[PDB]
Subunit: 268 residues, 3 copies
Amino acid sequence: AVKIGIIGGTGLDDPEILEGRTEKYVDTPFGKPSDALILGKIKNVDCVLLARHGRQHTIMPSKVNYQANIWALKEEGCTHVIVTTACGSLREEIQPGDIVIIDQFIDRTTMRPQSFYDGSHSCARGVCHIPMAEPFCPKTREVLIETAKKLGLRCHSKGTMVTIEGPRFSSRAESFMFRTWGADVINMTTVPEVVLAKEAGICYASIAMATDYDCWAVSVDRVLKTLKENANKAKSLLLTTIPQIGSTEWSETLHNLKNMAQFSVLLP
Amino acid sequence: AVKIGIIGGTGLDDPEILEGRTEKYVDTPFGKPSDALILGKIKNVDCVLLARHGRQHTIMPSKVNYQANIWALKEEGCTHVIVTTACGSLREEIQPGDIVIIDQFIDRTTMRPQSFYDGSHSCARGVCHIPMAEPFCPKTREVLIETAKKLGLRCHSKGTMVTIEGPRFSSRAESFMFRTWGADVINMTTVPEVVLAKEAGICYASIAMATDYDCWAVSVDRVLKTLKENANKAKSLLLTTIPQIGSTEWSETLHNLKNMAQFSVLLP
Amino acid sequence: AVKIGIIGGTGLDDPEILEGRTEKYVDTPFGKPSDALILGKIKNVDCVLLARHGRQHTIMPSKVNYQANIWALKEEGCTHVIVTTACGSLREEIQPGDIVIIDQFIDRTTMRPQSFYDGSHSCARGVCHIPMAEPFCPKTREVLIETAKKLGLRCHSKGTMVTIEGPRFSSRAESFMFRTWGADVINMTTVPEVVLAKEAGICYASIAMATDYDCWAVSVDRVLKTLKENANKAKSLLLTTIPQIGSTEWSETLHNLKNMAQFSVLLP
Ligand SMILES: Nc1ncnc2c([C@@H]3O[C@H](CO)[C@@H](O)[C@H]3O)n[nH]c12
Ligand SMILES: Nc1ncnc2c([C@@H]3O[C@H](CO)[C@@H](O)[C@H]3O)n[nH]c12
Ligand SMILES: Nc1ncnc2c([C@@H]3O[C@H](CO)[C@@H](O)[C@H]3O)n[nH]c12
């Protein structure tokens, strides 16, 4: 049995995606999640939807409580967490409207807690050095890629996301630099979301939707405009991918993730 | 009508630059500015001078209240903000004593608020994603460049400033690395000063004075020594540039900046 | 007369290394050190041992009070500070088990105070811009290198340490990137430890022990396993190096360090 947590990004968090919906506000040892959890289903698969920036989008990337969001989904029983995020393209071949099933990231954030084990919560004691060689779940990414193919969607099978602190967009000099570092797309929320999901032993995958070419011309209006035009893609991908995940066995994948997380903790 | 805000850097904030001076201490929703605002004129142009590190230079780069400084200048009616800053040269052709009218930056700071919209001030509500493709005002930079030419000063027409957190200087390994990233000069205060000026809809330009070659030998004494020897250059440049700015029309430039800033804000 | 402060890293802080031991808990203007100071000797040389993460290793890298640790050693009279640290190798020639007498660093940390002069302690007033061209003491590194040679140990004479914030390990994309930046080894504690030692006018050197190849496969268990197998090397190196340091004259070296630190401070 699996339960899919879904974190929706800017203009990519439509509750209508789930049937038999029920709102549920929760609390965690790390504070309150961005907004209430929406419990529902996609076919016969249990899901939990959460708006990363709050349903009215009032939380900037730097201020999102990533710890609470991941902890709440974990506490709810989620075995998987698939998210959506807008991003700028740092590669000509990645055109706005394209989906990128990212497999790597480059951290450029500075003021964000990246671990549950901060030595101040009973629920998570000790020091945790979580491995990040493969930040995203390969099995989940695989089904997303195949499903995108079945839907005839322009989709890139891999990509490195550079996550900046924000809220400002990058300067042109930074944009060029990120390209030399091997970054393919850029956003403000992948890190530490992917890191905390790992510590929680959750299969995490990200559906990145290119909304602009950054500036190597990006603006809020341009991003919102592209998201509005392409939101249906991520929705369709999730609706078709989730039932597939629910039809396969994950016991082993989840076991290996649990072990990796457990053995990354150093106790007193 | 224009009003020029001038933020003076280390040993580059001489109040004598303005005539008909008047001291004015102010407060802002983000706290107190580094020091009192000095109101005065350069020819027929109204100006507002502010010492970035306080008149006695007691504030380290990491601790400068960039938000309050920019907000105070904005509240005072400034349409432009031209600043001075010492910096290390990362390029052989940029010799100590040379002026660099920077046009780009690379952020390496880590503990600095970079937006007025931090969701805790009525004066600035919502989330702001300010564009940084062109961080500095091209029209202002243009007049600075031409004026430097008329003054016969060694001046570089462009350059990328890498702003480090400090207060320590860079290691040699970092110095070499910055060069590979395309950085031309290095300092500790350009970011987030330039970013906040943008959010405020202000035309911002920076007069960077190379004071050393970093270490790709830099020391406090070396920087102070070079600044003392070349301070007159920035003063003369400002005195000659400002009247020129006041003689041209900026209504359109300021309108486009206001629009960019306004449309970068996402309301609830 | 010299006094060697020794900061022991993960599984590299054996108090048995000193004879005539005496435990001593202290306080500093910056708070409490990671654990009690252990006073003792190695031959005829006075030493002070301190466990970076606490004797039970309960402090994550981001939370170590580097200021208090360095200040306590300084207050105790230490002229030198030699430390041990595990690290990942970013170079094929640097094999796990190898020692690296690092000479440079690249900062990737984000939430760490890096100066004693934060404008809130009487003991350190003003603004300090400490030079970092040569972060590590060349004379101390020289004796460590020669001693390693006399012990027949695989030892690299130089290397650039990239210090990440942690507590998570790097992603593969970050690992590759660090290699392009010229980094040779990677850890989570060199910065700001080396910076604060410099401000304190202390000769600082680091004995880096490669424990893995990062991921360009690293895990907590792998690191602990390698450290357990090679801990004896760092211990032997320290035991043999320290008496040599005590047999030479450092008055001039220490004088130049004191001057550099003193002249890096800007008073009101
Ligand atoms: N070129 C770009 N650079 C950085 N972030 C973004 C984004 C993402 O969309 C939002 C900003 O418009 C924010 O959540 C960020 O993660 N779209 N395009 C971007
Ligand atoms: N090589 C260098 N690296 C970093 N900052 C500076 C500076 C600037 O001058 C001051 C330090 O001396 C500080 O305000 C910083 O922005 N001059 N030379 C520098
Ligand atoms: N590949 C690697 N990356 C980052 N840090 C480390 C370390 C160091 O060892 C500890 C983590 O296992 C921590 O103190 C860190 O500084 N070993 N291997 C590492």
